Nucleic acid binder design. Structure first.
Ligand SMILES: CC(=O)O[C@H]1C[C@@]2(C)[C@@H](C[C@@H](O)[C@H]3[C@@]4(C)CC[C@@H](O)[C@@H](C)[C@@H]4CC[C@@]32C)/C1=C(\CCC=C(C)C)C(=O)O
Ligand SMILES: Nc1nc2c(ncn2[C@@H]2O[C@H](COP(=O)(O)OP(=O)(O)O)[C@@H](O)[C@H]2O)c(=O)[nH]1
Ligand SMILES: [Mg+2]
Ligand SMILES: [Zn+2]
Lengths: 208, 99, 666
RNA sequence: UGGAGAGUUUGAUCCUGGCUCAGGGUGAACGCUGGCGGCGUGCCUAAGACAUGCAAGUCGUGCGGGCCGCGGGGUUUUACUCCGUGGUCAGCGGCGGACGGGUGAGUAACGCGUGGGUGACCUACCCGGAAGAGGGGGACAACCCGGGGAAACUCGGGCUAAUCCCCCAUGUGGACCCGCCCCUUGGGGUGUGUCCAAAGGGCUUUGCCCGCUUCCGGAUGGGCCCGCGUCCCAUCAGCUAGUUGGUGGGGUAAUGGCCCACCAAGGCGACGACGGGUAGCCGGUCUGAGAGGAUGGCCGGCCACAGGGGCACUGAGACACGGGCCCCACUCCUACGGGAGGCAGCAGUUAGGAAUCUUCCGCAAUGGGCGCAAGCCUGACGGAGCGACGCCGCUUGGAGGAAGAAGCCCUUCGGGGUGUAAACUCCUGAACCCGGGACGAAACCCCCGACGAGGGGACUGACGGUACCGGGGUAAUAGCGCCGGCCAACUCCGUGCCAGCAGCCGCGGUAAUACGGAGGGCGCGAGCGUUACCCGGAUUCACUGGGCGUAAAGGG
């Protein structure tokens, strides 16, 4: 099950600030903001030079903890992107991004991905009509990801759908704050995702 | 304890007992035949053999012999017979052997 | 279509001393409880019968003989009991034992006067002992029409009805009123019954002192109200062989014998830890016990069980908490005196066999497949009394004897197999001479193993008497790895129970710091194989006081032999004494047989320590060798006629009588 | 669209080289944990034995009866109890029990795989074409009587029916011997001779329906034959008498030493015969950059076997898994004179083993046998159950929230860690509740038509009140491995070459990042580890892709 537990901890360790919390992570306290360094007892000590391995494992975890997903699924998705025709680097991200529980986060119906998931799970979401509750569900090109109706008027939805009025949503997504809808225009592109992750390393991770 | 398929065995015995007879008949008969044929009984041999022939095809009707089983037996009877009647005899009476 | 009231369930046990009648008592119980005829082998552990609208669950096997454990387990699991008594054996020395062990668990029991037709057959003779030996409050329920040979019929006191038997084939019985004479003999007694029964109902007491007769319905109420309290013990009678006193003892059952309800609820423990009453509710969590496993050639593996709570069902799923297993109860079965009744369930308080299940062995707890994964009590404690030395011939029968107790320790966990932790040989634990002997027929026959049957050994202890001082040199200088370790000690005997005390008594240090450590491994080690027979040379004090060395030749071990050569002769020059193990004991024996018990303890190399009264007997303390201890369970039970039991704990080691010192040179 | 290496011989180096590790896989087991669902899958060992139940039958539209319930009663009354139809019981006859289902013992072999040959053959039922169905006789059960038996059943008289059997006819036409013609291994013609057909039921009754007989053709399923491919051992080198060939017989549906008689000496073998070990073969499966290496469970094909072994019978087909005979071994009954049996069918029992399930529901669907149909049988099949055995999806919560409680650990005692983690604050609401609730099922049949097309009508759910849908709805399960190097992730205390660790190098002998605990950390998560076994790494058997002066290796 989707990890669970101290996250603004991973925020640390990886040393590259993460928005695993959404709102808070922005305030002067993504944790990494106050104590920017690997947890544990040692944490704040002269870090030995990373091994060729350590590096790639670390970059993989980084990318995986972003989308908060089990190592199993992460790998399958990887192995899938590989055999797929196209630059595996981009493709991998391609599907990673198609995760419904993620398209929810992106479209703004959720502050964190952790949240976006619970929403998707509790059928508060819909796909071109019928509602879906499988985080893993993968969005195709030209779909409407709306908030169900029983949902529409629920504190959370609003507030979140509120900070929206103004802010823009990725070039591969069109959102209608009102109708609380949202289309998955085209498949996200390489740069469109300003991730602090280098795929080429993660790729090389699964090469060993 | 049991299965009424023995009906098939009972029947088995019968059918067996039946063609078991016409079976042996065509045999002894087939011999009484080739016997004379070789012996010299030209026409009185053909006679028997002409009878043998019947019995054969006759049993071919049922499940005794069938297909060539009949035909094969024939082609040999009236093959060894004709090949014994030339032991100086000329096919006298109108046996099965064709002119 | 109820058919199950619970208040009609009678789970009794027929327990008594041998000879008695137990078995003959039952094959008969099951002839009356079911001769039906209407115009229309102890085949398994527990069997059911129906006597005038009551289901009886009997578990006849007792025997009493040396080993009980089976009599005491059935007892647990079942409600009532019938301590059958041989009316004949009057000067009966073992009428006892049995009962004195029943209230020992807490269970009600009537008594039966069996061979009333056999010479010396006297009814009172037993009550004149049933209250003289044990001390209960029995109630002569019947009287004999003709004592012993003249056994025609019997008469009920409580109900004043006469009964007669025209034979012993069990056919021409009938109920003919009291025969001319007798009659009078009754009254006084039918009043003493209506007098004893007054200690229960104050309603059968006042009407007694007013002039009214207590109704046949309440009178029994008194009798039964109190029988079940373990106060009264309704004694009846009848030649189980000639069919007399049976069909009237079968009423004796139901009428005074407890029902599963009438009995005090089981205790167990939850996964957390805490007692709890297992309520005999056919709708409470499922939780029963399994006791007697069996191998039926027809239904495979059977597992007899007694339910305390909930109900088991045909085609269900249980779970053995004892051995963490999801057993599958696939079919249930009730053992009938002549057939297999395939019922569909065992509601609490009832017992039977569940076909299926694998892991479930003797006394396991099975709860519903979800119910509180608890584990009942059961905890019995019948340890051993007689053990043997079993040496499996060549190293071949030591493998036929290994799979000999791997199926004979699950089929009877009332013994203990343990390899003598000092000299190979394995010790077979028994509950008497009969226990080990018959394991010796089957483990030797049904297992075809043919090992040895001699007797256990004794763990002696080499040592000395006089303090000596020998040299501890070694030196081997030919040219190089020299090997130079020299020492000199002070070996002196200490009290019989001192141990090992080494002394690092070197002045300036003629034997290096590094080398005194490994010089203690040579003295301590070498003490292993004694200077007489070769046993642990203990009870001495070593005192390394001298010994020198060399600059190159010395070793971390060359000094190992140096101190091992000083101990290997200080005990040989200091007169070696062969000590032995003396066990403390206590024979709870009636001071009646106490004369020959304490004597025997002396003609047995030992010396007696005391006798402080206990209960109605008296315990004897002392010490005995262990060579002269073997097979004492059939020597103590001998000088006391079964009325003797003993314990045993180690103590000390002590020299052999100088005459058991020139013997041990084997 | 595809290739990563590292640790270990030395004081140090380079090379050769072996060992070892990281990856993936499994019908799996074992350990510690363990919540939901879907789809798969579950005796790999004893091809050891097996209690119980069920797994193969069905047609009254083939025939005669026995028994039971209806008509009308045969005659003038019950009489020689007849008739027409609907239940039944067994007997006749008809198909089907040769398919379906199980298993891998055997088998190194035309067994299998593949591609072909049948001038060397077969094929019930199913299609299309041609011609027929004419007379006659005849038995055996059933049944009645009588006899033997413990039982299983069995024997003897005497009836009797039929699509059972038999004789005569007609032979479209086919089968044979001979001759001629075309052809070319026995393939088509054609003349003389000879020989062979057949059955009757139901109705709405000179017309249909189901059958029959002969012949030709199709379709499907096969038998036999052949080229090539099909493991280890030369420390198995020689093998062979029905052996190799021939002639003539027998035999078969058919070729052939497949058998027999008599001739002739031949057939086979380092291109590995013969012998020994092992094994069911394939589609595929796992691994692999590939070449290759292992493997052959579930699903599909072929084979082989039904306690061990031999053998025929019936039949289109079997040398028959719930058929038969006999031998042997085992199980049971026995009146001891003789009888009944075969779970490698479904479920289960026991034994063995480290280990592998319910004596479940339904014929609703698909498929099969029988039947004109109605319908019947169907442990095949469609489902359910149990097991993290596997794979996929999901939950154990979401947003807030301290320059940061307590406890615990570390500390230069300033403080640092656990850590937004908790608490606490709101909000969604697995579970669980009331209510609704299937798809799979539309034909066979019935009515119109013409019992053709086409049109219309009706009966049919084991799973299942399950899935799913709407409303109501409580913060509601985490372990396990590891933390010296390979290899991610370290401090304190115990301990003192002890206790123990350990895949390799090695760690442990008073300050151990290596043992044991704790705090902390890393990986992964209803799983995590261990053990077996296979491929990889191992260009370490090298075809791709190696070597032989001294490293192993040049033959005197
Ligand atoms: C049947 C019954 O109820 O008891 C029977 C059965 C009995 C209790 C037996 C005594 C003893 O073996 C018992 C032991 C514990 C013996 C040891 C193992 O083998 C056990 C598996 C066995 C179980 C029952 C058994 C076998 C009995 C006897 C034996 C009497 C012997 C003599 C010489 C008087 C009895 O009852 O007298
Ligand atoms: N004379 C007589 N003998 C009896 C009677 N009951 C039992 N017995 C005998 O007692 C002996 C042992 O009986 P059993 O029940 O086997 O003894 P248990 O095993 O100790 O109960 C046998 O000889 C029986 O016949 C009785 O009523 N009268
Ligand atoms: Mg007895
Ligand atoms: Zn953060």
């Amino acid at each position: 099950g989707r990890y669970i537990g101290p996250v603004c901890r991973l925020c640390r360790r990886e040393g590259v600030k993460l928005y695993l919390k959404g709102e808070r992570c922005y305030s002067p306290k993504c944790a990494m903001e106050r104590r920017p360094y690997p947890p544990g007892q040692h944490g704040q000590k002269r870090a030995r030079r990373p091994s060729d391995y350590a590096v790639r494992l670390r970059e993989k975890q980084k990318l995986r903890r972003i989308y908060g997903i089990s190592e199993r699924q992460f790998r399958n998705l990887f192995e899938e992107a590989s055999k797929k025709k196209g630059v595996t680097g981009s493709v991998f991200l391609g599907l990673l991004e198609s995760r419904l529980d993620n398209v929810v986060y992106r479209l703004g119906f959720a502050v964190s991905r952790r949240q976006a998931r619970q929403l998707v799970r509790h059928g508060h979401i819909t796909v071109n009509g019928r509602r879906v509750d499988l985080p893993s569900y993968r969005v195709r090109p030209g779909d409407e990801i709306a908030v169900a109706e029983k949902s529409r008027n629920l504190e959370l939805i609003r507030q979140n759908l509120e900070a929206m009025k103004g802010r823009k949503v990725g070039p591969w997504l069109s959102l209608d704050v009102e109708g609380m809808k949202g289309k998955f225009l085209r498949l996200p592109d390489r740069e469109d995702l300003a991730l602090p992750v280098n795929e080429q390393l993660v790729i090389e991770f699964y090469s060993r | 304890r049991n299965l009424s398929a023995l009906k098939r065995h009972r029947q088995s015995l019968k059918r067996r007992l039946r063609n078991k007879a016409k079976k042996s008949a065509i045999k002894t008969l087939s011999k009484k035949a080739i016997q004379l044929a070789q012996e010299g009984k030209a026409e009185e041999a053909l006679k028997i053999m002409r009878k043998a022939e019947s019995l054969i095809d006759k049993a071919a009707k049922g499940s005794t012999l069938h297909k060539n089983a009949a035909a094969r037996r024939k082609s040999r009877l009236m093959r060894k017979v004709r090949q014994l009647l030339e032991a100086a005899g000329a096919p006298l009476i109108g046996g099965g052997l064709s002119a | 279509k109820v058919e199950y009231d619970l208040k009609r369930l009678r789970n009794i046990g027929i327990a008594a001393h041998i000879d008695a009648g137990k078995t003959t008592t039952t094959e008969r119980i099951l002839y009356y409880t079911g001769r039906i005829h209407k115009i229309g082998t102890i085949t398994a552990a527990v069997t059911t019968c129906f006597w005038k609208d009551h289901r009886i669950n009997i578990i006849d096997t007792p025997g009493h003989v040396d080993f009980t454990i089976e009599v005491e387990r059935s007892m647990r699991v079942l409600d009532g009991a019938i301590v059958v008594f041989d009316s004949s054996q009057g000067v009966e020395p073992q009428s006892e034992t049995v009962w004195r062990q029943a209230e020992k668990y807490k269970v009600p029991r009537i008594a039966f006067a069996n061979k009333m037709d056999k010479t010396g057959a006297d009814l009172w003779l037993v009550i004149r002992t049933m209250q003289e030996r044990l001390g209960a409050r029995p109630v002569v329920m019947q009287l004999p029409i003709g004592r012993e040979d003249t056994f025609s019929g019997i008469i009920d006191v409580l109900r004043m009805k006469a009964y007669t038997y025209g034979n012993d084939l069990g056919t021409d019985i009938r109920e003919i009123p009291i025969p001319e004479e007798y009659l009078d003999q009754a009254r006084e007694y039918h009043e003493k019954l209506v007098e004893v029964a007054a200690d229960f109902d104050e309603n059968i007491m006042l009407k007694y002192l007013e002039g009214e007769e207590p109704t046949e319905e309440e009178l029994v109420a008194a009798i039964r109200k109190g029988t079940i309290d373990l106060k009264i013990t309704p004694v009846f009678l009848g030649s189980a062989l000639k069919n007399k006193g049976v069909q009237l003892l079968l009423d004796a059952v139901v009428d005074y014998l407890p029902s599963p309800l009438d009995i005090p609820p089981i205790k167990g423990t939850t996964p957390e830890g805490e007692v709890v009453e297992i309520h005999p509710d056919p709708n409470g969590p499922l939780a029963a016990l399994a006791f007697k496993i069996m191998a039926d050639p027809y239904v495979g593996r059977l597992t007899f069980i007694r339910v305390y709570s909930g109900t088991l069902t045909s085609g269900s799923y249980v779970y053995n908490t004892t051995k963490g297993r999801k057993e599958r109860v696939a079919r249930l079965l009730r053992m009938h005196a002549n057939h297999r009744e395939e019922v569909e369930e065992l509601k609490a308080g009832d017992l039977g066999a569940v076909v299926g299940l694998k892991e479930t062995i003797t006394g396991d707890t099975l709860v519903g497949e979800d119910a509180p994964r608890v584990i009942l009590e059961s905890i019995e404690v019948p340890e051993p009394v007689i053990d043997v030395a079993i040496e499996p011939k060549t190293k071949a029968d030591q493998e036929k004897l290994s799979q000999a107790l791997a199926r004979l320790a699950e089929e009877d966990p009332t013994f203990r197999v343990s390899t003598h932790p000092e000299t190979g040989q394995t010790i077979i634990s028994g509950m008497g001479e009969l226990h080990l002997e018959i394991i010796v027929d089957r483990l030797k026959r049904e297992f075809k193993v043919d090992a040895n049957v001699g007797k256990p050994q004794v763990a002696y202890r080499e040592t000395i008497t006089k303090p000596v001082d020998v040299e501890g040199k070694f030196i081997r200088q030919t040219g190089g790895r020299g090997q130079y370790g020299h020492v000199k000690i002070k070996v002196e005997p200490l009290p019989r129970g001192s141990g090992f005390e080494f002394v690092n008594a070197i002045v300036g240090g003629v034997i290096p710091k590094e080398y005194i450590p490994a010089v203690q491994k040579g003295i301590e080690e070498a003490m292993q194989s004694g200077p007489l027979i070769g046993f642990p040379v203990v009870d001495i004090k070593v005192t390394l006081y001298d010994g020198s060395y060399h600059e190159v030749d010395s070793s971390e071990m060359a000094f190992k032999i140096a101190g091992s050569m000083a101990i290997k002769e200080a005990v040989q020059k200091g007169d070696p004494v062969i000590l032995e193990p003396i066990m403390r004991v206590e024979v709870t024996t009636p001071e009646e047989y106490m004369g020959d018990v304490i004597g025997d303890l002396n003609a047995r190399r030992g010396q007696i320590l005391g006798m402080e009264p206990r209960g109605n007997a008296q315990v004897i303390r002392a010490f005995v060798p262990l060579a002269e201890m073997f097979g004492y369970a059939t020597d103590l039970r001998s000088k006391t006629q079964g009325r003797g039991s003993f314990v045993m704990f180690f103590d000390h080691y002590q020299e052999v009588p100088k005459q058991v010192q020139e013997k041990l040179i084997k």
